[PDB]
């Protein structure tokens, strides 16, 4: 009864929902050998998160908690960060989340800056406790990236002037891009171990279209190249949805790219109950809209609706 | 047309002075301090204000590029042009304080500096260079003139920034010595003042202060446990922006509600101009449970007298 909306804001305006930055472009690709599955970022049009989804923007790939030195063979340069939820408390494993919400989504080299602030002990002040702050990396693929059991490996560089003392992580972009999957889930309870509680994998069903995705290039500590990270709804809709809880009328809500100043519709698309769009188009492309550009819902329908190529 | 607040809770909320969660509600007097922030900055009816834009991971951002070393002869200060945060050319002439996003406090702006080189006579994306490094920027500094379309910052290496697009990501404080969070930097610098601005706020109704959304900041060395008060969470100000609801009068009465039990904890007076007053003398804490939020309740005058905090 509660109708569903899109909100007005445009491209430039909204954020990605895998990865603290704005969104930079539209794009579409095919995607048919990849298996999509992305954990954060993951939300029904009626308002259900879904995998590691939360909803602050600065929070996602964030790590807060403390860290208990060196791990148990690793190096000087790397420290055992036990994690908590976003909130302070402690990680409930027993519940069918996939890890810690916010946790990276992502097979690569996660590289922010971990600060640190005392907590003190015979003393007494919040004025007078110490910090510092250091580059790290959090590798999303190293035996010890084991969010789901409340721990991740950082390492640092030639520092070692990290304490066991409240962390938290403040990610940054990637340390290079030599293995990074956006495509790969890692290992959330380390080698071998089974992923549970997932948000599932997502896919075009109708002949000729592919998905759409919300894209940002992301920065790197080195090396070559430009990595980006495609996300399936902006995290701004994300809290749309999470406060309208407006009820899904069909499985696919058709929407619109509009031009509010002439009214004229670049091209439609088919929002799906399970939170990402599908477009009729074929190839890996951008896709070129005016700045003022937004999504506008026209009406529910079927997975069998045909769109209009674009 | 109704006016709504979001239903959020304070720790699924972002400060709209620096992109970090909110932890705590909090008054205290402010006589002795000019309260006017320039992030965070949006009236009832969605009208952004100040240097406010939309994305809360562009709050104290920069985009741009380097051009080099700034006019001294220090090896360790580089000279950021700043664009607007869309990457398009940022106009100095708008009646617009500096660049959206830009901070608004007095103090050592701590992040890190990312680089990624432009493509050249042969080119890809992936023959793209790319170097990142924490670097400071002084919001006091002579150089420290983003209205004038540049800031500079400071970092540890002396050798590895290109003259190349950058972007800087916030993080923290590198030190709060003299970190004054009500005090506006000079976006042009020291020969001319400010423009643009979003107007100072201030309580007038006898026993009322401000109430504040707060945060704390990390910081890169040095001791302390900085914050920063913000007069809306972002998440409203993307509300009331996108809503655009006319506000029926100059203050909307708003009540912090438990949702478990449905007790009022509070009232507290919701101005048109985007701040919130409470009915409190003294810096205090706001003792309030976790899942507790702000309700709407009705359109009053400036003279409702608020039951006591
Ligand atoms: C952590 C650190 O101290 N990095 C240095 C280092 O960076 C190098 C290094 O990581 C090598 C390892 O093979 O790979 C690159 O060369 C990397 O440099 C980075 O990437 C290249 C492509 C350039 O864009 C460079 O500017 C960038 O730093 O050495 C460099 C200088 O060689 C700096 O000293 C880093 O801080
Ligand atoms: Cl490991
Ligand atoms: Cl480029
Ligand atoms: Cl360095």
């Known amino acids: 009864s509660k109708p569903f909306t899109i909100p007005i804001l445009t491209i430039g305006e909204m954020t990605n929902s895998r990865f603290p930055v704005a969104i930079d472009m539209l794009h579409t690709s095919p995607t048919d050998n990849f298996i999509v599955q992305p954990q954060n970022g993951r939300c029904t049009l009626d308002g259900e998160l879904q995998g590691t989804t939360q909803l602050v923007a600065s929070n996602i790939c964030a790590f807060r908690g403390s860290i208990s030195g060196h791990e148990n063979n690793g190096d000087q340069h790397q420290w055992h960060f036990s994690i908590t939820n976003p909130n302070g408390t402690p990680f409930d494993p027993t519940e069918d989340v996939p890890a810690p919400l916010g946790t990276p989504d992502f097979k690569g080299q996660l590289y922010g800056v971990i600060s640190q602030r005392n907590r003190e002990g015979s003393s007494g002040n919040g004025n007078q406790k110490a910090?510092?702050?250091?580059?790290?990396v959090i590798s999303t693929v190293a035996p010890r990236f084991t969010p789901k059991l409340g721990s991740v490996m950082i390492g640092t560089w030639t520092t070692d002037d990290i304490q066991d003392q409240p962390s938290r992580?403040?990610?940054?972009?990637?340390?290079d891009?030599?293995?990074?999957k956006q495509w790969e889930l890692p290992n959330y309870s380390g080698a071998l171990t089974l992923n549970m509680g997932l948000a599932p994998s997502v896919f075009p069903?109708?002949?000729?279209?592919?998905?759409?995705?919300?894209?940002?290039?992301?920065?790197?500590?080195?090396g070559y190249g430009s990595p980006y990270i495609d996300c399936?709804?902006?995290?701004?809709?994300?809290?749309?949805?999470?406060?309208e809880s407006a009820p899904s009328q069909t499985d696919v809500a058709?929407?619109?790219?509009?031009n509010p100043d002439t009214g004229r519709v670049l091209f439609e698309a088919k929002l799906h109950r399970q939170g990402y769009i599908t477009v009729a188009?074929?190839?890996?492309?951008?896709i070129n809209?005016?700045?003022?550009?937004?999504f506008r819902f026209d009406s529910w329908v079927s997975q069998f609706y045909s769109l209009a190529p674009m």
């Open 131 to 136: 910090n510092r702050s250091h580059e790290g």
């Open 169 to 175: 992580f403040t990610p940054v972009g990637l340390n």
């Open 177 to 180: 891009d030599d293995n990074y």
């Open 205 to 222: 069903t109708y002949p000729g279209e592919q998905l759409l995705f919300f894209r940002s290039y992301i920065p790197m500590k080195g």
């Open 232 to 243: 399936l709804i902006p995290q701004e809709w994300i809290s749309h949805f999470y406060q």
């Open 254 to 258: 058709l929407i619109r790219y509009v």
């Open 281 to 286: 188009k074929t190839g890996d492309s951008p």
């Open 289 to 294: 809209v005016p700045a003022n550009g937004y």
